[PDB]
Ligand binder design. Structure first.
Ligand code: BGC
Ligand code: BGC
Ligand code: BGC
Ligand code: CA
Length: 297
């Protein structure tokens, strides 16, 4: 009784960073090269978009009101009403051609996000140019580690002592010891090795049983992993190859939303994947996810 359905047919170039906003029953996400932050009201079925002046790679809820996003190499704050967007902090001013990629807020309201050299084609870029950062409620920025190829999916264990992290071109899901009170991490190790047919690990979220779900870019699937054993538990395929990310949403976080891309597909690829770029929902997984945390600054 697992069902995969295409639920929003808007043909995004590279849908990414899905987050469920329970208060409005809306899905927030981005379409990266289209430079828009999107909010899809699942009830009225209307989509609203805020255009920004650079590629926008993630979006998160802002506790005091509105949203935050990573635009270019800048952490930004958004007031949805006035469509006002302003800079909270800048990173990689060091770099001629970087951008943020995936980001998510930690259980203490810190906005974690990492960067990458900009691509000329999917996974074609100058190597090791990224770093992982976090924006504290302070608006101060902590830099964690560099030498990242493409900073990607991330989440936190339910006990808040472990941080899970994907650098896409490492083809592994990694884990760190994590301290909730300070936001520090330590002891990086591999917890899952991607198989060849699982292609590039991209976005990731944890479920209520502590298992990890990873979107497989080019693999046309999400997989469920046990970070304690390093074994895959489950695979769910989708009719689009460039599955980018996933999050839980809907009633009690019982439904999974999956984003995907059409960028990089040739004419044949497009015809073979008519729903490339659209938003998918997966029902009947038999597990629930958890609420997103809101940024505390
Ligand atoms: O800045 C505006 C936003 O503030 C949030 O706290 C509300 O949940 C959104 O519906 C609103 O659009
Ligand atoms: O060396 C200085 C540079 O270090 C980088 O890691 C930071 O992101 C830059 O913003 C800073 O200017
Ligand atoms: O690494 C696979 C893909 O992951 C996405 O998060 C990035 O935005 C893309 O640029 C990248 O090609
Ligand atoms: Ca991604």
């Amino acid at each position: 009784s697992i069902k995969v359905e295409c639920v929003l047919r808007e043909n995004y170039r590279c849908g990414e960073s899905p987050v469920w906003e329970e208060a409005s029953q809306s899905l927030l996400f981005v379409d990266i090269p289209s430079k828009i932050i999107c909010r899809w009201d699942t009830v009225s079925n209307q989509v609203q978009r805020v255009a920004v002046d650079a590629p926008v790679s993630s979006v998160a809820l802002r506790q005091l009101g509105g949203y935050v996003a990573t635009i270019g190499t800048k952490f930004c704050a958004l007031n949805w009403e006035n469509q006002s967007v302003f800079v909270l902090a800048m990173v990689d001013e060091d770099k001629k051609n970087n951008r943020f990629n995936d980001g998510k807020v930690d259980p203490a309201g810190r906005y974690f996000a990492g960067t990458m050299a900009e691509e000329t084609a999917p996974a074609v870029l100058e190597r090791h140019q990224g770093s992982l950062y976090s924006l504290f409620p302070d608006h101060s920025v902590k830099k964690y580690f560099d030498q990242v190829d493409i900073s990607n999916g991330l989440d936190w264990s339910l006990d808040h002592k472990i941080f899970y992290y994907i650098d896409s071109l490492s083809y592994t899901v990694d884990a760190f010891d994590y301290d909730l009170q300070t936001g520090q991490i330590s002891n990086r190790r591999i917890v899952y090795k991607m198989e060849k047919d699982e292609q590039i690990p991209d976005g990731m979220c944890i479920d209520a049983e502590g298992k990890l779900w990873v979107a497989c870019y080019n693999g046309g699937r999400v997989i469920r992993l046990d970070p304690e054993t390093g074994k895959r538990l489950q695979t769910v395929k989708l009719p689009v190859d460039k599955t980018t990310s996933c999050c839980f949403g809907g009633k009690d976080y019982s439904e999974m939303y999956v984003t995907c891309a059409r960028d990089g597909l040739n004419a044949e690829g497009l015809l073979r994947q008519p729903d490339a770029g659209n938003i998918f929902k997966i029902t009947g997984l038999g597990v629930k996810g958890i609420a997103p945390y809101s940024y505390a600054g």
